[PDB]
Design an enzyme around this catalytic site. Structure first.
Site, PDB file in Angstrom:
ATOM      1  CG  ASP A  43     -10.645  13.445 -27.703  1.00 27.48           C
ATOM      2  OD1 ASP A  43     -11.344  12.579 -27.142  1.00 27.48           O
ATOM      3  OD2 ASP A  43     -11.114  14.289 -28.492  1.00 27.48           O
ATOM      4  CD  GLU A  78     -15.067   7.154 -29.362  1.00 26.49           C
ATOM      5  OE1 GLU A  78     -15.610   7.618 -28.337  1.00 26.49           O
ATOM      6  OE2 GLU A  78     -15.281   7.625 -30.496  1.00 26.49           O
TER       7      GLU A  78
END
Lengths: 545, 543
Positions: free
Chosen positions: B38, B214
């Site tokens: 991430d 997302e």
């Protein structure tokens, strides 16, 4: 501890619509026979005596066991794994611990066996033994194979075999969920599978070209000189079913019956009433009327299509007049009521028999021998309970938060109805912010509600907190004048859960709003179990108002 | 008599770097090898800052600095203190999720916004005027879901965009998610009630049942607002997609070409395979060229990931309406050209290493390399650096199986082919004492390779934990005359645990074992294999 919380009484009331709408006539009983979280049922018989066991994962004690003479009226006689030498779930994940059990009586040596997989304590696949389940069982004997769902079969010639689920040999896995049924010869004097006798008897399942999921829960039966292998297929969720194979030899080759599956709700309309789903993982026995019966697990989802009370134990009559067993009406929607076997009266909930339908369990804590339905999670209830001389449950508050993967001082009761109330009277004066006692509803340490009494600064507060993915948030709080014992209730109406308190004993004030039971479902929390309703105490409270 | 680890050598030996030696002006992708998922990046002036998620590792949100996008210095962790990071009892898949870092020129302040499933935090933001020094304690934000990101418009107006679930009862399918935006109050650091707005429902094409839209980020270019998102979930279907709008709160329209970053359509038999590519974040390079960092995996020969999701970068062309990841839809190359004029100094002068490196740790500084971490608790709780060198580990009465801080100094596996070797000076007193090496996906999936005492004798043991169940694989009695060397060697899915009493000849204990339980594919979760210097006084292995 001095000043420890005292729970003076509990009332659990079930109020499920299906029972109110389908009152029993004489000679009828309700299905499921075990309401709430009693998965992976296995049954055996010695003479007139039936014994029924279920899985239990991290609950303490493990493998609840029930006795019956008639398949309708069951007495919980305890738990098969009821000692810390048999059950080592102190640090165990909510979805590990004791998996599917199988119980089998061997008439050749007059011995009962319970064989299971325990993902804890280094046990793995284990077997315990007893001449008499009422006396308890041996410590576990570790068995030399991997996989899950072991079952033990005793042939007429006294020879013994263990069947179990396993994975395919390394690198031969054809798809996700591709599993195998393996058989061993079992040495009854050694209590061990015999090296070099293993053989795969089912690869994938009935029809490997359809990629069957998790062929598992194998059992071997012998009838009319032939060998039958009955298995769950499709996984213990939406595609659950039971399938059957036949062979002339214990070790195969096994041929699937042309009609398969023989038990399932997976094809039925998704909007039926009194829905029973995920049906499978069956085990057969000859009933007291000469008829066969099969126990199996299934679920009864609420109005949001989720399961909050776990997988429950059902039973159906079985016709085995021909080559293959037929679950009577096992492929059409399950009915709420069955006829009792010929000449047995329904005595459920009386005379120490396990209850059914919509019952009211009133617990006043007036004996040290607490009802077997009161359990711990991860550790034994005897480590934190005391029964007061004049009645009432004193709970020693462990310095353990509900979020820890550790035994908490919480006395738990399985939620057994989609509509229920659970009410308790609490006599307790917390002294600092670290002290809390009250009710908890638990899927796991990571998914739960805590509803309890604490003290912060000068005031007592009722708090309602929600834990999701192991993150606790305060939902609502109320200052209360603790002048006398307080009553606490959780009420579930399907997915609607209400937490309320009463200082006057009659009027219950809702704390916050009604909250969702979503985190109390298997669908959201994951795992293998139902909602547990707990009398919780802690000296490691982290909620602050 | 606590165990002393006197030395560690970590050696990476991945074939891709051997077959593709660097020329000047080239650097290897991924820029962060091993478990650094991430990624998010921001810029102040010439200074780039890069952050990654960290789940239950301690400390949290590792943070890296660069002037050129090639040579990175780990400057620490954003969530450094126990007041910021409360993962003591946290599951291996909870804790700190995706972070986003953003520099606000309007008030000369850095923000790091994330979700911490621990300590009551949930969605949180921390602030700093200087990431080299540290950050505030967490400010709790009044919204749910994951992957938050903060956007500062030209006029200083501020917005938080995040992933959320659909309205209660609106859920169309498993994986149906929503992108939601709020106006953000910069004076009070809170989202403003009543300003929430769903700006993306499902994904680019709701009729295809897109899952887990997302990782939203908003960018402003040429007066229009761009929403860049991950789509497909962080596994085999990962991708990045892009939308555009004339206003911060929409309506947002998907670009006709979508996704613009993915390896999911590529051939499953390709060499140097990069998979699960997505969760990107754009920045302006020192080039005047755009770049995007993103996560992806490099599976081994069994098709599994043992080193977690790593941080990659690609140049980005944004001369037209939509950004294009240069060659982001064809198989990833091992090498990239450095931005114009930057030379590759990775592994030198305190820059983070890359390629096939050798890390020799002699524990001769109290300033321990930031790559040495704890799981669930800070390393400082159980380490002492001895006067003339060496790591003394205080053995906690905590078993590797507990969801509790253990006395284990951990190092991320950063190569599919590696060796990790340590010298152990230790005499255990009882059965309850063990020290050695562990390879950990979680407390429920690990190997433990350690020195034990039982009866009168010392034993090396190799034990496997699967689903929280520990089984002893192999045992050897050893004459503990002098220190012992322990090694774990990984060759893809082949792991070998060996010990040396003479210092040269390493004897295999047992057979080679599978790395299957060290993969995300088997153990589940969000992280990679952690290699640890382990001590315990609650050992349960018996010979």
């Amino acid at each position: 501890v001095k000043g420890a919380p005292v729970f003076s009484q509990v009332v659990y009331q079930g109020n499920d619509r299906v029972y109110s709408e389908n009152p029993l006539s004489p000679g009828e009983f309700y299905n499921p026979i075990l309401q709430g979280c009693y998965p992976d049922p296995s049954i055996t018989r010695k003479g007139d005596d039936y014994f029924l066991v279920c899985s239990s994962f991290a609950m303490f004690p493990g493998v609840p066991i029930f006795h019956s003479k008639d398949l309708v009226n069951w007495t919980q006689i305890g738990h098969v794994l009821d000692r810390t030498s048999q059950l080592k779930v102190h640090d165990t994940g909510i979805s590990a611990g004791v998996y599917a059990p199988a119980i089998k009586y061997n008439p050749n040596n007059d011995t009962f066996y319970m064989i299971t997989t325990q993902f804890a304590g280094g046990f793995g696949n284990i077997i315990v033994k007893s001449k008499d389940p009422f006396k308890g069982w041996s410590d576990p004997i570790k068995l030399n194979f991997d996989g899950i769902d072991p079952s033990i079969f005793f042939d007429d010639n006294g020879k013994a075999y263990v069947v179990h689920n396993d994975g395919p040999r390394r690198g031969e896995e054809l798809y996700n969920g591709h599993r195998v049924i393996k058989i061993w010869e079992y040495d009854v004097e050694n209590d061990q599978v015999i090296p070099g006798t293993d053989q795969v008897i089912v690869n994938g399942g009935v029809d490997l070209s359809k990629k069957p999921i998790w062929i598992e829960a194998p059992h071997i039966y012998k009838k009319d000189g032939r060998y039958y292998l009955m298995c769950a297929e499709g996984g213990t969720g939406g595609w659950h079913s039971e399938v059957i194979f036949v062979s002339d030899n214990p070790k195969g080759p096994f041929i699937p019956a042309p009609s398969n599956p023989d038990l399932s709700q997976r094809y039925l309309d998704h909007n039926r009433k009194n829905m029973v789903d995920w049906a499978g993982h069956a085990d057969l026995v000859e009933g007291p009327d000469g008829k066969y019966y099969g126990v199996f697990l299934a679920i009864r989802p609420n109005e949001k299509g989720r399961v909050n009370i776990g997988r429950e134990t059902f039973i159906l009559p079985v016709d085995w007049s021909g080559e293959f067993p037929v679950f009577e009406n096992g492929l059409i929607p399950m009915e709420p009521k069955l006829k009792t076997p010929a000449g047995v009266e329904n005595k459920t909930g009386k005379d120490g028999y396990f209850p059914n339908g919509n019952f009211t369990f009133t617990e006043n804590f007036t004996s040290p021998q607490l009802d077997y339905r009161w359990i711990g999670l991860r550790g034994p209830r005897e480590e934190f309970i005391s029964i007061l001389k004049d009645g009432g449950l004193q709970v020693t508050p462990f310095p353990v938060n509900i979020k820890e993967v550790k035994p908490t001082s919480t006395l738990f009761y399985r939620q057994q109805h989609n509509n229920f109330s659970f009410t308790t009277t609490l006599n307790y004066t917390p002294k600092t912010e670290k002290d809390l006692a009250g009710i908890t509803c638990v899927q796991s340490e990571n998914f739960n509600y805590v509803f309890g009494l604490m003290k912060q600064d000068k005031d007592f507060h009722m708090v309602l907190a929600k834990t999701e993915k192991g993150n606790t948030r305060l939902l609502a709080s109320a200052k209360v004048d603790m002048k006398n014992p307080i009553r606490l209730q959780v009420k579930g109406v399907g997915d609607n859960y209400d937490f309320s308190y009463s200082l006057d004993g009659n009027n219950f004030v809702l704390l916050g709003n009604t909250v969702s039971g979503d985190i109390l479902s298997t669908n959201v929390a994951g795992g293998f179990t139902g909602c547990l309703i707990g009398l919780h105490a802690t000296s490691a409270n982290d909620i602050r108002v």
